[PDB]
Design a protein around this ligand. Sequence first.
Ligand SMILES: *[C@@H]1O[C@H](CO)[C@@H](O)[C@H](O)[C@H]1NC(C)=O
Ligand SMILES: *[C@H]1O[C@H](CO)[C@@H](O)[C@H](O)[C@H]1NC(C)=O
Ligand SMILES: [Cl-]
Ligand SMILES: [Cl-]
Length: 271
Amino acid sequence: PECFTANGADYRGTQNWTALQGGKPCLFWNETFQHPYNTLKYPNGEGGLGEHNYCRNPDGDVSPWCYVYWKYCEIPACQMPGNLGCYKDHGNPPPLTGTSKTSNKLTIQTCISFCRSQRFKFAGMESGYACFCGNNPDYWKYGEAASTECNSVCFGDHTQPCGGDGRIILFDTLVGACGGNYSAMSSVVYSPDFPDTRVCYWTIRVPGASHIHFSFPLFDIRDSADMVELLDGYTHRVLARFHGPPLSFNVSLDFVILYFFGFAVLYQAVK
Ligand SMILES: *[C@@H]1O[C@H](CO)[C@@H](O)[C@H](O)[C@H]1NC(C)=O
Ligand SMILES: *[C@H]1O[C@H](CO)[C@@H](O)[C@H](O)[C@H]1NC(C)=O
Ligand SMILES: [Cl-]
Ligand SMILES: [Cl-]
């Protein structure tokens, strides 16, 4: 997995063809001087830009893209954990049965935060303005669709996609939550309200794990005043502190707490 954002702004991958099936080639960033995004404009790899033609999103568009006249990149690996894909929608029955609403200022988190309040574990955005909530495991009923088909911008934030009509983009409602209990072998903990701009803690507990490996593919804390803690859940000894993190570390427990005073922290446990 190579993005932990909703718009792939973190993506640094190799792909230089907009579509893996039937794609036009990407022009090189250094040769993009004519266009606003140039290796000159951003140096030493800022914005992921570099002497290459790989797909990138240096302007907070909804998704990675590259110049050609300019096109989105369809990348399977670029999908934030928490995002279940985007699926087709052919009307009733809808993919998420439970509830619906519409907002002119809708954003991925607003939709999530909304479904979370009803206690639905799944949320969907359609056409930029429609939010749907369900506990349906079969949101994939109508079939999986390419990611680019979900790129309609959220009306509340144009940096994020909210799906296109007949196309719905699915999020686990745990994303961005203020706290939570985590049981799976691995998952990602996102800063609260992620993807949109309180203090909260997350308890990660996996029975019979010898150790857990932590990872911070996204670290973006605004001030040293702000801080992220990791804590042994049994004793509450501090295993790490961070302010405004080397690539990984292993913790030899099955019970840890994440405390925050965005970021994405990926934990992958060993049984
Ligand atoms: C894509 O990038 C690779 C190196 O990562 C390069 O060898 C290749 O020529 C590029 N492909 C195209 C079609 O531009
Ligand atoms: C950009 O870098 C590529 C790869 O080294 C090179 O082929 C291209 O001509 C470069 N041009 C400039 C102006 O930096
Ligand atoms: Cl269709
Ligand atoms: Cl909350």
